[PDB]
Ligand binder design. Structure first.
Ligand SMILES: O=c1cc(CNc2ccccc2F)[nH]c2nc(NCc3ccccc3Cl)nn12
Ligand SMILES: [Zn+2]
Length: 350
């Protein structure tokens, strides 16, 4: 119960203080690469995207970074009616035309020049040992023998969010409509997709990876939630436990393929739906950690059984569509999570 879940969280906290030094090595290499990238005519306006980092909290040495590139006067064209994937289209020509394939922006061309640069600069680094790993649209580096960094390049648009997000980000009941309006004034992002996901096609995918940070840092119905003794909630802790539960289950079954398609996306999306459904800070009281986590678990199970997990920004897109994850995989994860819940989560102890 809550006592055990608390113990897990204190365990993870100790390993977080020991990767401050590893974060320094990452920031060192990242800033070096942003500097050499800015010398390129195509990537001149590249920059770091503020997102908080760690997709894996059971592997404190694996890091995740996003570089953004602003592309002004951008025209988007939705692929099929997939809602999430888009072709990128544009009198005067500019350096980005070297990435055009016909009249659309090629992610392959752009990723290829992106990779060639980093690989060239990685070899030029002599103050630390850093290797590049084999190609999956991101670039992955190994610093020392333990630390690894995934670098994703995203296009940034400061124009209005695409129309498929119009009924999404439904946080009005929790954080108020004016916060939703504010968030929707922030830019949006487009990333290259996998050859795994989708149909090779030069479509880009909507990304809102900058939004989680905005909400997690201002997460209460109360403006002072988690800012004094009398207002301690367990939202952050429940998201951490949900993430750890999926990471642990995927490790336990890494030999089978049955869980390859589940990721922290699904847990996060399910978490923030529970925050929408339970908007009151009193539904997240620190003393009720065990009950609050159980709510998160049972909500996730319900999504699994009904095969419905709406993306948070594009509700028409079902992350748990059988078109994406087959019925048998959800049923399996349901079985494992039900077993965990029923046995006070033995996947959690030492
Ligand atoms: O960066 C993130 C993070 C989350 C995680 N959830 C989440 C984050 C912040 C606040 C609330 C949340 F529930 N979801 C997400 N969806 C998209 N793009 C849309 C999309 C991406 C991929 C496939 C289909 C679709 Cl339609 N980006 N993106
Ligand atoms: Zn709080």
């Amino acid at each position: 119960g809550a006592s055990k879940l608390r113990a897990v969280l204190e365990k993870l906290k100790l390993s977080r203080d020991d990767i401050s030094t590893a974060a320094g090595m990452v920031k060192g290499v990242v800033d070096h690469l942003l500097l050499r990238l800015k010398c390129d005519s195509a990537f001149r306006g590249v920059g770091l995207l503020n997102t908080g980092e760690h997709v894996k909290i059971s592997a404190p040495n694996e890091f995740d970074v996003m570089f953004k590139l602003e592309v002004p006067r951008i025209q988007l064209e939705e692929y099929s009616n997939t809602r999430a994937y888009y072709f990128v289209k544009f009198p005067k020509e500019n350096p980005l035309s070297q990435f055009l394939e016909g009249e659309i922006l090629s992610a392959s061309k752009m990723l290829s020049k992106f990779r060639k640069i980093i690989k060239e600069e990685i070899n030029d680094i002599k103050d630390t040992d850093v290797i590049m790993k084999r190609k999956s649209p991101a670039v992955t580096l190994l610093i020392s023998e333990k630390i690894s960094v995934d670098i994703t390049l995203a296009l940034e648009s400061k124009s209005s969010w695409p129309a498929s997000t119009q009924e999404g980000l439904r946080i009005q009941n929790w954080l108020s409509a004016k916060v939703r309006k504010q968030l929707r004034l922030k830019p949006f992002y487009l990333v290259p997709k996998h050859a795994k996901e989708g149909n090779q096609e030069e479509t880009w995918r909507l990304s809102f990876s900058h939004i989680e940070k905005e909400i997690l840092n201002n997460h209460g119905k109360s403006k002072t939630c988690c800012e004094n003794k009398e207002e301690k909630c367990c939202r952050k802790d429940c998201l951490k436990l949900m993430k750890y539960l999926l990471e642990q289950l995927k490790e336990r079954f890494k030999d089978k393929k049955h869980l390859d398609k589940f990721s922290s996306y699904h847990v996060k999306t399910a978490f923030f739906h529970v925050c929408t459904q339970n908007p009151q800070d009193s539904q997240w009281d620190r003393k009720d950690l065990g009950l609050c986590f159980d709510n998160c678990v049972t909500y996730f199970l319900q999504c699994l059984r009904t095969e419905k997990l709406e993306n948070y920004f594009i509700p028409e897109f079902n992350l748990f569509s059988s078109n994406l994850i087959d019925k048998r995989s959800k049923e399996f994860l349901t079985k494992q999570i039900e077993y965990e819940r029923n046995n006070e989560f033995p996947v959690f102890d030492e």
